Amino acid sequence: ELVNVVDEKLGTAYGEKIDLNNTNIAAFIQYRGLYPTLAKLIVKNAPYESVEDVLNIPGLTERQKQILRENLEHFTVTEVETALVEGGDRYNNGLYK
Amino acid sequence: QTLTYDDIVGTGLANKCPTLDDTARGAYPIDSSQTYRIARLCLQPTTFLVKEEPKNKRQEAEFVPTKLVTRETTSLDQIQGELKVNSDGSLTFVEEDGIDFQPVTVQMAGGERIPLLFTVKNLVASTQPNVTSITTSTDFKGEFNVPSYRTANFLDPKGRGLASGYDSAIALPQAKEEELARANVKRFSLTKGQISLNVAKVDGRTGEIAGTFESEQLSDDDMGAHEPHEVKIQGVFYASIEPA
Amino acid sequence: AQLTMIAMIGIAGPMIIFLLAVRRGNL
Amino acid sequence: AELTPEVLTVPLNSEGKTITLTEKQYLEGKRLFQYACASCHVGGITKTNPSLDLRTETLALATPPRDNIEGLVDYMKNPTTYDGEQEIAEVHPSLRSADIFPKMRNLTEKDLVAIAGHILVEPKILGDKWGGGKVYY
Amino acid sequence: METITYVFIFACIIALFFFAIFFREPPRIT
Amino acid sequence: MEVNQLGLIATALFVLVPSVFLIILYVQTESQQ
Amino acid sequence: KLPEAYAIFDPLVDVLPVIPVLFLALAFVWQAAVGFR
Amino acid sequence: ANLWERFCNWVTSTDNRLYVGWFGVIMIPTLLAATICFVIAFIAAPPVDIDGIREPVSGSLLYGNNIITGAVVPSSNAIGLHFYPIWEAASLDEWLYNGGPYQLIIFHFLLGASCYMGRQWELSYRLGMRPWICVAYSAPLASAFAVFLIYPIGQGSFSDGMPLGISGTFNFMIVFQAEHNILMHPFHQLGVAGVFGGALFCAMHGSLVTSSLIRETTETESANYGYKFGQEEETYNIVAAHGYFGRLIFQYASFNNSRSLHFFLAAWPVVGVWFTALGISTMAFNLNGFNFNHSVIDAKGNVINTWADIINRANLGMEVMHERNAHNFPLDLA
Amino acid sequence: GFAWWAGNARLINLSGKLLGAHVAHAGLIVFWAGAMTLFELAHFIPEKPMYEQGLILIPHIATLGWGVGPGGEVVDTFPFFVVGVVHLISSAVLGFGGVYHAIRGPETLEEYSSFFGYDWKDKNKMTTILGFHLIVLGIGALLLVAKAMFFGGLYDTWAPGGGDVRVITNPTLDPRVIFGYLLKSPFGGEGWIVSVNNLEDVVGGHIWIGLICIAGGIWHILTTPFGWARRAFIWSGEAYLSYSLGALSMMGFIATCFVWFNNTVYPSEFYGPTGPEASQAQAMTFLIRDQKLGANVGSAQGPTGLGKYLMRSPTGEIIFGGETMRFWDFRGPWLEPLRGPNGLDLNKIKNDIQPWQERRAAEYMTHAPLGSLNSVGGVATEINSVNFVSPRSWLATSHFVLAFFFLVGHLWHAGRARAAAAGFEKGIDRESEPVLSMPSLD
Numbered sequence A: 001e002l003v004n005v006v007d008e009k010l011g012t013a014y015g016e017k018i019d020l021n022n023t024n025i026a027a028f029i030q031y032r033g034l035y036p037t038l039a040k041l042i043v044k045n046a047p048y049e050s051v052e053d054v055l056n057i058p059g060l061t062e063r064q065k066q067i068l069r070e071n072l073e074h075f076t077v078t079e080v081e082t083a084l085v086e087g088g089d090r091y092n093n094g095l096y097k
Numbered sequence B: 001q002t003l004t005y006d007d008i009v010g011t012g013l014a015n016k017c018p019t020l021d022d023t024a025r026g027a028y029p030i031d032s033s034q035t036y037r038i039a040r041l042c043l044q045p046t047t048f049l050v051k052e053e054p055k056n057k058r059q060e061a062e063f064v065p066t067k068l069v070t071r072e073t074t075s076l077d078q079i080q081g082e083l084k085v086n087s088d089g090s091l092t093f094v095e096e097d098g099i100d101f102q103p104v105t106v107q108m109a110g111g112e113r114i115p116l117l118f119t120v121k122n123l124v125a126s127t128q129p130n131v132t133s134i135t136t137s138t139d140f141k142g143e144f145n146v147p148s149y150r151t152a153n154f155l156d157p158k159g160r161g162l163a164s165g166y167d168s169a170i171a172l173p174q175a176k177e178e179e180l181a182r183a184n185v186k187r188f189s190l191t192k193g194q195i196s197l198n199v200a201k202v203d204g205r206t207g208e209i210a211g212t213f214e215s216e217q218l219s220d221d222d223m224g225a226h227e228p229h230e231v232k233i234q235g236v237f238y239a240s241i242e243p244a
Numbered sequence C: 001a002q003l004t005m006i007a008m009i010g011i012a013g014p015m016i017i018f019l020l021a022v023r024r025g026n027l
Numbered sequence D: 001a002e003l004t005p006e007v008l009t010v011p012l013n014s015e016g017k018t019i020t021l022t023e024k025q026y027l028e029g030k031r032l033f034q035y036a037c038a039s040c041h042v043g044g045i046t047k048t049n050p051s052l053d054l055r056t057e058t059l060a061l062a063t064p065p066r067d068n069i070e071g072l073v074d075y076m077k078n079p080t081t082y083d084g085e086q087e088i089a090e091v092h093p094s095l096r097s098a099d100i101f102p103k104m105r106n107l108t109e110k111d112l113v114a115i116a117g118h119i120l121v122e123p124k125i126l127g128d129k130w131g132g133g134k135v136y137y
Numbered sequence E: 001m002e003t004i005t006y007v008f009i010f011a012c013i014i015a016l017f018f019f020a021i022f023f024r025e026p027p028r029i030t
Numbered sequence F: 001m002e003v004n005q006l007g008l009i010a011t012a013l014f015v016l017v018p019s020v021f022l023i024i025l026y027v028q029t030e031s032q033q
Numbered sequence G: 001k002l003p004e005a006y007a008i009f010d011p012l013v014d015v016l017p018v019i020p021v022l023f024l025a026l027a028f029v030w031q032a033a034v035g036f037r
Numbered sequence H: 001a002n003l004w005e006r007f008c009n010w011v012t013s014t015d016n017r018l019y020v021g022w023f024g025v026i027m028i029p030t031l032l033a034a035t036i037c038f039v040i041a042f043i044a045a046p047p048v049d050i051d052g053i054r055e056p057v058s059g060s061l062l063y064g065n066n067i068i069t070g071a072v073v074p075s076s077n078a079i080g081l082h083f084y085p086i087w088e089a090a091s092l093d094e095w096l097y098n099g100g101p102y103q104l105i106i107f108h109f110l111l112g113a114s115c116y117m118g119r120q121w122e123l124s125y126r127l128g129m130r131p132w133i134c135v136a137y138s139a140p141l142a143s144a145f146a147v148f149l150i151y152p153i154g155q156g157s158f159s160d161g162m163p164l165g166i167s168g169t170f171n172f173m174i175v176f177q178a179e180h181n182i183l184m185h186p187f188h189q190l191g192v193a194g195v196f197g198g199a200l201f202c203a204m205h206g207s208l209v210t211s212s213l214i215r216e217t218t219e220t221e222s223a224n225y226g227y228k229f230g231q232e233e234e235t236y237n238i239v240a241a242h243g244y245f246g247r248l249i250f251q252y253a254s255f256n257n258s259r260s261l262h263f264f265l266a267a268w269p270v271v272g273v274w275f276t277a278l279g280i281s282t283m284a285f286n287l288n289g290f291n292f293n294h295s296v297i298d299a300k301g302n303v304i305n306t307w308a309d310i311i312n313r314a315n316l317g318m319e320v321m322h323e324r325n326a327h328n329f330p331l332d333l334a
Numbered sequence I: 001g002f003a004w005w006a007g008n009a010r011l012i013n014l015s016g017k018l019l020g021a022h023v024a025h026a027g028l029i030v031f032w033a034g035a036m037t038l039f040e041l042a043h044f045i046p047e048k049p050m051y052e053q054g055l056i057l058i059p060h061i062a063t064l065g066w067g068v069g070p071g072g073e074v075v076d077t078f079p080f081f082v083v084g085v086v087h088l089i090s091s092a093v094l095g096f097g098g099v100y101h102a103i104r105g106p107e108t109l110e111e112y113s114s115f116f117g118y119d120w121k122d123k124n125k126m127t128t129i130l131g132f133h134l135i136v137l138g139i140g141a142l143l144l145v146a147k148a149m150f151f152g153g154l155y156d157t158w159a160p161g162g163g164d165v166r167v168i169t170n171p172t173l174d175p176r177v178i179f180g181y182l183l184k185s186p187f188g189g190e191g192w193i194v195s196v197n198n199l200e201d202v203v204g205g206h207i208w209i210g211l212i213c214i215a216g217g218i219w220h221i222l223t224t225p226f227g228w229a230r231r232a233f234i235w236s237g238e239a240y241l242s243y244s245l246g247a248l249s250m251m252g253f254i255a256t257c258f259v260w261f262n263n264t265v266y267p268s269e270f271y272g273p274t275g276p277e278a279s280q281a282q283a284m285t286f287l288i289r290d291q292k293l294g295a296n297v298g299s300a301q302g303p304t305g306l307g308k309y310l311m312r313s314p315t316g317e318i319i320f321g322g323e324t325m326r327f328w329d330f331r332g333p334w335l336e337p338l339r340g341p342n343g344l345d346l347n348k349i350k351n352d353i354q355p356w357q358e359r360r361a362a363e364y365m366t367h368a369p370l371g372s373l374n375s376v377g378g379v380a381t382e383i384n385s386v387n388f389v390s391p392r393s394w395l396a397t398s399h400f401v402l403a404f405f406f407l408v409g410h411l412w413h414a415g416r417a418r419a420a421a422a423g424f425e426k427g428i429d430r431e432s433e434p435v436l437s438m439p440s441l442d
Ligand code: CLA
Pocket: C016, C017, C020, C025, C026, C027, G024, G027, G028, G030, G031, G037, I003, I004, I005, I006, I007, I008, I010, I011, I014, I017, I018, I020, I021, I022, I024, I025, I092, I095, I096, I099, I102, I103
């Protein structure tokens, strides 16, 4: 009944793809075209019900929609975990090098 | 004629909210059509009360006064948000951003320290319907979010944590871990708090208002280690209104 | 080229002593 | 082990052409990297933005690709963000900004190549240390 | 009990200081 | 604190036995002169 | 860098700041000469 | 016969069992204030938020410490180098939470200890002595100034001054090593030489004098009864001690002049400890120990580790763990 | 009576040989000032900040307004060269006078001329020599006022626009300000005289000190010490040396803290950033970086419950968070544009940070005055690569050491002077040992 919610979230898609609802913003460097600009937008407009909702972000150019489509398979969505979004931890989670 | 940093620094006035002239008994009228923002909301607590634990069943413990030990570090300020006109003429302030939390620790009689996250995070606060003017009888009631006092990276003194740290009592390698689950497994609480803001001064010229506030919320539970206390905060506020 | 002018400096000192002794002066 | 021509051989462009540095260029580039870049990029990290490093795989995923001499020489002239969407000459040393970043004033075109060469050679020698930080010290 | 023990010993040392200084064997010459 | 119960007796004796030894020898030294 | 017309004495100049130290050393050659009197 | 002059006579009297003096006039109150606050705080002070992060460290016996783990905890990093006397706190409860007592104790102690050194000069003058015993005590005194005052001043916080406790001391010296590589600093190496050498020459001198006591006693009595306080004759044979020690090494590495020998005994540990106090005092301005990390590389450029790189791995583990909740940005610049 | 290793004590009563010692040593000082400058200039590269180059004297000249323009951009190197040459040349004249007076001049002066001769115990002659030197010192302090007001001004890191040489037209004469400094606490947020933060106050203080020193110089030429002063001091050459050792030691400690904390008369453009500055600059840097990414730096709670980027000081001022909370007394020209009356201002932070401020903070963060003894820059666990130790660490450490030893020298000579004055510096008289005539303690 006492579960570490972060460990439990490592057992979800969160542990294998970029979770558009939880993952720190530095993850968006692993794929091209996404940092900083689109990552900035993806984070500020979270949360998403489906991976496909990112494309309904107002203001997207057509080049930006192409990049996201190119990368939809590297994204997921799971429930927002409070512990991962509080403290502005999606912008800076205390990890550097 | 305002002050400068070098007049304030070290005085304690940086932790005080701006005050309104005791002449300021006007009214800021609201154009259902136009939109409005709060450019600055400042909350300056003056009193911290804590609910005791009365041990029996039908004595219901009182709120007792506490002593502050964290100094002039308590006020919320530079808070801003939307100020909306609802269909039935109530206003609703929606917090967007600001220095909207301060960690505080007060001391009860006997020595017990009570830490708390004094906050209005994600505050939504509404008035009664049919306002049309903000006056020296306008009241806001609302609720806000109270996240965990420590966030997920925080490491306890034995190195245990939620998003970092050990998952067991490593100094006791063959101890039975069932007794220690509460201390070993950290949990991120997220609770609600309630606030009433009572307007008592209003500068009709400038859109500045000010008054009294009472909020009720929970203290720190040390990541689920122990049960929180109930806290009641009294103080004074000031806010400034802009046509959006 | 850092002997074309240094070495002379470091010798100046002891050469003064080698000349005052050998000519007995108020050392 | 030694500084063989195979290690001194780095991509010239995205086309796939390649260039073999001399030992001289390599040590030239190392020296110039210490003069102009190591205050922030010691060991291939970036002290003022640790999320972006000088590892070859990171440069490769940069827009435009920077895992090659051409991309790197360009970057030193007209630096952009990682997605290429904005020019950051105002806050990153570059020949385009040698007025505010004086150390770039006397860097010549071959200097740029020696610096870019060093950046691409060093991961081949040091491995994960390059850009890995204190864990690998 | 451990607190009392620690302070007790410390208290004995301070008392010993007192006697060692003011109730010493007085050094006498030759 | 959950502390070794015998620590107390151990400490008391550790102090008491050697101290009494010293006192015994001192006092009978003064009774000589 | 120095002005061009003094370019010449560049390496003498790398050495000049150390000369004060030599006076301390020189004090000890003098006393060795005189027998630490 | 006048009042002030009779007072002055008592202050400076060579007849008080313990000399007072004008330095004594400041020393006694300040060391009583520091002593009394220390004792009470060590036993019963509540936990103190040393690092300014609302994470109080329990230092006193009644809050679950023993003699080895207890301490008066340094004042809060939130205070930095601000003066925090009692009357600047809203209440004693606040002053306690923020670590007031450390400040009170260290300022009173450093004052009283400075006057202690001066008192040593003074009584030396009243008794017709030579005056420099106080110069020898300046070495320990400089050391206490370094860890309680100088290092805080340079790092900008009394929270980084040495704790007043046994494990707090160790905490200070471990963190120092990670942040300054003090082991690899030459001035600390001279401290060790001054302190190892000091204990060596202590043992040497004591064993040599003791080896050459002149027979004055029988096998049933302590040899110590062979010396009578105030006797004019020396109580050991120095030529015999010189004769043994110079043959143990060679003649000219041995002292036959007792004045040179005892001056040597004084200068070696004093000068070594000056330097190590200077070490702490200059590492306070981040002029750190020699850094030979990755200084050896091979023909290709692989790093070839040395023992300095191994030291670095240990310093790294100290660095990344200390004050594990207090750093939000990647470099620990103070 | 002295041995070779205390041989300069043989000069105590040889006023002529002792003159040469002093003037020859004065030459050594001027030599090093000149030689060291030319060494620094020969090694100087203008495109590199001075503090990447191990320079401690060029920064003092630049600070006087010579050689530099707006931003501390080095404009003309010739003033540096001139300063070096004139010092180096001047040391030959002092060397000449020193060796002459030490070796060939009259051993003792007081027979050749009653004006230059002195007895240490002649209280009137000693206060007269003191007076002349006070006047000289007063003149020197006024020279700085003249530079600032009449010959081109001084470098002003606070000049609007990034810094520049500015002529000081309204020096501060108000003694409430000038002497106000002398009464501020030496503790944090106060900083005694180390906190002086504008050149008006610097220049005005030198007006006061010049007049005070000239005034006292005249005072001491014209008077003799009053009796309470005669009875409280020891009057001998060694005693006087001890007094000055003490004064130099105190001044060395002050200078240490001056160069560690003060970024007005040690501009960070030349000397590098202070420890506190560098530490503030790091929080500035990541605040900028994170806010560009979308973070709301005002509402961001860090692990402890305190703000990750911003928090309150104990008097409530909004300040940078993290460990740098200790350095919130820092003031610097790159930072002040962001300060309102409650401290750092959230709307200026969100809206008004300029590229030049981003640049300056990254630069100072990466040039924090941390470094190894062998000049490897950074934290002690850092790898080799960056050759760098701040001029402020070099200047702070050296002067702490010298200050310390001059305090030891003061104690050494003050004790000796007392004992020699009383007649027992050489040991206890066996036939009259004071303690043996005193009653026993017990
Ligand atoms: C700042 C350093 C300094 C200075 C200026 C002095 C100065 C002096 N010392 Mg001291 N001394 C010093 C350091 C210093 N000492 C140190 C470090 C020691 C420890 C070893 C001593 C030990 C010592 C002893 C034991 C004695 C002195 C004595 C003297 C005085 C007489 C010396 C004499 O006749 O020599 C004669 C020496 C020579 C003839 C040799 C040549 C010396 C010249 C000056 C060398 C300079 C060369 C230079 C490049 C020339 C430039 C020329 C150009 C400018 C024109 C003289 C005033 C003596 C004294 O008090 O006399 C009563 C004495 O007995 N000194």
